[PDB]
Write a protein that binds this ligand. Structure first.
Ligand SMILES: O=C(O)[C@@H]1CCC[C@@H]1c1cccc2[nH]ncc12
Length: 169
């Protein structure tokens, strides 16, 4: 009964909010209906956000994900799937942003964010940021220009959070 209890976010637009927070700790506190994972097409949750979310589930997310890939095959870059949220959320929306460190087309970042519009409210990281190699300022731009549903962005590093907020407007 205290689900989606987001607290302390700064409003960027009518529907995009941001906080300097650890997304795993935020998921455990606010009990969101949906937490977004920064996934790859094989749902191999090794590093960055995906490795942290999987570790918090004691590898249950990876076991479920490997079964999903055995049944369905890999996702597309820009695509997503809904799986269990385990101890983090009702659901995990695994979204595949382009990985610039693999030379993937940054133009697929808009298609990746469009997955968010299928959910009324989400706790999310910035897609294609961090270990995926895209400029986080650009990822925030594409997020605010694409997502229309209510998205709560968790940015771990205070210094990156300050750069994103300070430069947004
Ligand atoms: O080699 C990698 O980068 C990892 C290791 C496990 C397989 C995975 C992978 C293979 C091919 C394409 C990929 N795109 N995002 C991940 C990915």
């Amino acid at each position: 009964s205290m689900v989606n209890s987001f607290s302390g976010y700064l409003k960027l637009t009518d529907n995009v909010y941001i906080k300097n927070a650890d997304i795993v700790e935020e998921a455990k506190k606010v009990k969101p209906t949906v937490v977004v994972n920064a996934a790859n097409v094989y749902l191999k949750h090794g590093g960055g956000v995906a490795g942290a979310l999987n570790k918090a589930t004691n590898n249950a997310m990876q076991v479920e994900s490997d079964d999903y890939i055995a049944t369905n095959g890999p996702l597309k870059v820009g695509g997503s799937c809904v799986l269990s949220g385990h101890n983090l959320a009702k659901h995990c929306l695994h979204v595949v942003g382009p990985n610039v460190n693999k030379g993937e087309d940054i133009q697929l970042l808009k298609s990746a964010y469009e997955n968010f519009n299928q959910h009324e409210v989400l706790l999310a990281p910035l897609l294609s940021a961090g270990i995926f190699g895209a400029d986080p300022i650009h990822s925030l731009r594409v997020c605010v220009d694409t997502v229309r549903t209510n998205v709560y962005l968790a940015v771990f590093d205070k210094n990156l959070y300050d750069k994103l907020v300070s430069s947004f407007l």
